[PDB]
Nucleic acid binder design. Sequence first.
RNA 1: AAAAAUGAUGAA
RNA 2: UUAAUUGCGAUAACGAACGAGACCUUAACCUACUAAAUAGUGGUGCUAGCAUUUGCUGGUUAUCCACUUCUUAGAGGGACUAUCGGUUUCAAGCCGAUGGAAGUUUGAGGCAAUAACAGGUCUGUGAUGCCCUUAGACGUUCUGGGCCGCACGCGCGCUACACUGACGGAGCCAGCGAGUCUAACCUUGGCCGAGAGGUCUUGGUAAUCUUGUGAAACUCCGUCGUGCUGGGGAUAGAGCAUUGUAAUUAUUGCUCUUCAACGAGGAAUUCCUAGUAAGCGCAAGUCAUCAGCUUGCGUUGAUUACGUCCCUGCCCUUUGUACACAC
Lengths: 63, 141, 206, 107, 141, 80, 67, 145, 71
Amino acid sequence: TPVTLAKVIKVLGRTGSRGGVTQVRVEFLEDTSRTIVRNVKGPVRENDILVLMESEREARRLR
Amino acid sequence: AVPSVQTFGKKKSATAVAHVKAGKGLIKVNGSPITLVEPEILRFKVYEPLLLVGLDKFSNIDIRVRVTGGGHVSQVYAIRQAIAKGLVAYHQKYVDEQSKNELKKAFTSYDRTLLIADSRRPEPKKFGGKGARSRFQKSYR
Amino acid sequence: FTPVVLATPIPEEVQQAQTEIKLFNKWSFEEVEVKDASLVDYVQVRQPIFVAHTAGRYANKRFRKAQCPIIERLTNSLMMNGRNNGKKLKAVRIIKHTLDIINVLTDQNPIQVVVDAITNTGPREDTTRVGGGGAARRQAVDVSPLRRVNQAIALLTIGAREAAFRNIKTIAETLAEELINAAKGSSTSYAIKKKDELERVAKSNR
Amino acid sequence: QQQQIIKIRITLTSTKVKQLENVSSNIVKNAEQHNLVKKGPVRLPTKVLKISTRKTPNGEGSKTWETYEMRIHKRYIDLEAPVQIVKRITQITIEPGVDVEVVVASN
Amino acid sequence: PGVSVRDVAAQDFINAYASFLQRQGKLEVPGYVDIVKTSSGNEMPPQDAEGWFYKRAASVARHIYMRKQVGVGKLNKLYGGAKSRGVRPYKHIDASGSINRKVLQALEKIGIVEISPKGGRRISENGQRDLDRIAAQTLEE
Amino acid sequence: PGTIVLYAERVQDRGLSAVAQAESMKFKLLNGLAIRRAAYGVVRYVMESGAKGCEVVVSGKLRAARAKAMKFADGFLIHS
Amino acid sequence: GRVRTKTVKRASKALIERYYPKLTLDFQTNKRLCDEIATIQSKRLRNKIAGYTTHLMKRIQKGPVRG
Amino acid sequence: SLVVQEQGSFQHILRLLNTNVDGNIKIVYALTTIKGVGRRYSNLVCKKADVDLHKRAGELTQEELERIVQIMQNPTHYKIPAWFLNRQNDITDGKDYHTLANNVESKLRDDLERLKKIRAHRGIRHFWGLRVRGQHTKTTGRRRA
Amino acid sequence: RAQHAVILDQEKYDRILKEVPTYRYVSVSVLVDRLKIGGSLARIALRHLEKEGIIKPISKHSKQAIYTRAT
RNA sequence: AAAAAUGAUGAA
RNA sequence: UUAAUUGCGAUAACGAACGAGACCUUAACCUACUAAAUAGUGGUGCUAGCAUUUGCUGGUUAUCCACUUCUUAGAGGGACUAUCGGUUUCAAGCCGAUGGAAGUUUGAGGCAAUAACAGGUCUGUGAUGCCCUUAGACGUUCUGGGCCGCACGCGCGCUACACUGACGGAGCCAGCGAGUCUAACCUUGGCCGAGAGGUCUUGGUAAUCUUGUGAAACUCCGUCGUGCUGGGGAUAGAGCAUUGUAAUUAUUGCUCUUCAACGAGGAAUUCCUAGUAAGCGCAAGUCAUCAGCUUGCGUUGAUUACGUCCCUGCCCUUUGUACACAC
């Protein structure tokens, strides 16, 4: 089943030339010890749950 | 003589004045029953102060509301605030404030503007556009 | 329940509304639940309202609109053509009619059907423009839950409005068919096919 | 002849709140200091006279607009008193910028 | 109990009092009905060709009952709407005065309104009598 | 006749009246006095009269065909 | 932003250097005292001066303040 | 509700004043196909011919259709206000006329030719094809005027 | 260019009295697109059927009528 | 690490 | 760090000034003061109407007695980011919650430095230098015409492309104004008229009357039924009125008739972050008449984002310069 639930534990900052994307760190729900960094489109909070279609790509374009 | 209070509710520029007093259960708005308040899609807005706390504590009072100013929606909101605040004032003046606080918690938990008037006010229009913020269309060639 | 005898007569349908707060005195918010985790506490169906009209202040804080009732947010996005700005009375009438039509067409809770449509029509992945070069590019990113519910509501109402334009069908009927198709996944609904299109572009630009 | 009634009304119009309230207070205190039963100074709604005009004398530049306004404050005091003291209150409680006109009525 | 024409819905009362006048057939319609379009701001005559004058008479009677006294100019402003001015923006336009004046005269003939020395036409003894009985009938239909 | 009456009153602190200072300096310039001498005399008189600040601006073709502004100030002035 | 200007800062400093024993930690009575111990042209400026005086008094309670 | 089950006597598009009147549009708005009758004129003609307004033109019988034609062709003797007409107090005989289907363009040509023959300014402007009612011609009316 | 029956003959009427009792949701646009009839006949047909009681109303409104099957 | 040329004479 | 040359501070500078802020106006709170027939409310208070256990009303300081919740306006109060928690290297501050009418500088404005621009205005001025003209006048008046002319290009706009609608009936609610005897201004009411209008009176120099400006979007019920169709109302014909000395090159209004393009608009490009955008009308300016314009006012009231420096630009610092008319 290609749906991964990950919870935002930290908001890193804004990315994108126009600032539209947000760096976040999320930990997986199935195992609470595997954290990854993702790029998110809209407004995000800590503890927000994201849906990861794919769950291996590290986020590029950092600051 | 008869126990009574007078309150008011206020939306943008509408003002409703409610006379609440020891009575029978009469609820009137501009001399007409609250069941005929318009619009009917918003009639439950003025039903809310009754249903949240229950009619068993409206069954011994009569309220008469006179609303002026504003528009059709603002007058409905003014009416509901006037009714809720009239109930609160009557329970303040002739019943215990344990009951008053029960009423206030019920109202403020359901909706804040039942007791406190919305503080949003119109922004004056400025020269150079149709509104407070919007400007006339600007051309360069 | 021993209706109260009262000098201003209240009809029994309004008397029964004392028991619990009921949307249009027809549809209950109790047992309605978001069946898509990550969208709980962004689809707010926990505090009941009698009607999808309240003059609430959800614009003065960043995330304040997440507590706005989801039926009211759906109503608010119906007030959108330029000729329909304002007209919340019209939008609320449309919402009431489409909820009735949903309950007649499918014997489920209309609020639950709306919630399922919103949870099913929010894109999980999207793309953003990147590259100050000559040829720009799209880079895949993920979508926040608030943006997911925002864009789900936008797609549902935009598809209903575009399908109601210039045809015999009423806007309430078209919105009912849109919500009913989206609540199960049909790919005949504008919102579902736009969500799949965005997710497929995001995968292609991954 | 024996302390006749008049039902007099004094009205006060000005563009200066301080001096207007000064003369109004002088009239009022004269009423109390002649132990006179009255209807206190009723203050009318303020009249804001607006003139909105372009700032430029020609028609060049950004289209900027000024709004000037006069402000008219009016009060009236109802009284009933003998002639010998209504006249002295006519000849006193006056100063520039406040105009006073006095009307006999039955109100 | 106590019934006045404020406990009944506006349109309900209007349609019932209009049907009453339709059965009674005493209003003495002016004669130029079905050629006029009821307002300079209107585009078409009333669609209910055989009952629009009775609808108007019922509306005017209820309006007079609600207010103290009302004249022809106020009926013209009340029933006037906005006028489509082609490629110009809309504006409010007063309704046709002859129709309202003859409605008022017809109600004077049937004894519903009188001369109201302070104003225009006001409600009568018998006007209150019949409008209140018909309102009671509409409530306990 | 008999309902209009005029009195003339002497102005205390003449050095604090901008109208009177501007009229006096106008007459000084009309008598052929130099702009700097006149402007500084006005500023000195105003400051000796007790003013917190004073300012004199002279604008126009002061010297040549091309116009310019000369500005003479003393003390402190507020603007807003 | 809510940064106090040098007018408020210096007035509060002078008030504390003159009237520390009279001043307290409560804004209401500090506001009341500012009218008698100083002449402030506006009520808004007096409120700002009193609230920065009480903020500095709260700072002084938990150790000394430079200046 | 006027639920009707009428037998196979329905008539489609029909000819009044050598004009093609449709038989599927309601009588009032179907008559407006004829040049010289508008929505007001059609409403008044139908309501003075005493036909049911909630009827399609196709189920009107021929005798009430001819009553409609007579009322339209000679309106002034059917209690019509006359201020309701198309050509009142004309320049030739001073009679109150209502110009109809094929006569509208011919009477328009008559007015045009009268103005052009007398060489009035409005007729000259018509001869040029420009606007005649005093409108500005600098910017608008370019693609055809 | 849609063609809709503006006059009701026997076949269309019997098709109404048979198909309409089956429809679970019934309205003006439903009759107009599933029976090839104008909105005016659609409104008349809804008003006709309600009086006998083979469709019943949930919500009667101008510009939107809500009917279901009788039971 | 995409592309981006030019701007008449005199003139406190 | 702040919106801020706003502060904490650092310090060959010390102490100051302008600007910012402070200030003023306006909007929101006050069941606390002082009142009010030019604002209201109550009194089986007076009188009278309708319907029957009493509700809705009509006249009420000029037919009375009380009161100030609503309205008004003087004096004041109120917020100071208050309290609590977190965070910064203490600090300046910042974030969140609570309480509160109000917690973006509470919202919006007014005012606003130095130095400039060959920016606009000589067509506002009996502000004005110089030049020109000055009786066949470029002075000042009268009549008529023009400024509006039409192969075409551009800017601001109005009306639309419809069913989230058009039309009909009914419902039925604002705020900001303005108004005449130095004369014909705002006009209720009655009568006539299909309308536009006419006519007899009336009130108002105005919280008093127009006016509750019964505005329009809007709501309900009905007709229409996806058809350039009852969408849209351009163009044109005929007639009736009003303003004015004069309406033709249609002043405008009204009635009937004709019923064009337009089915949402290429490249492009504007404005906007909450009672805001947008929809909707109203008053004032202009004004004899003419508002598709503007200045304000209220009615209905979203979506989206609380960010960035990609584009267009702004501020400060460092740096390079063959620029200084300043890329």
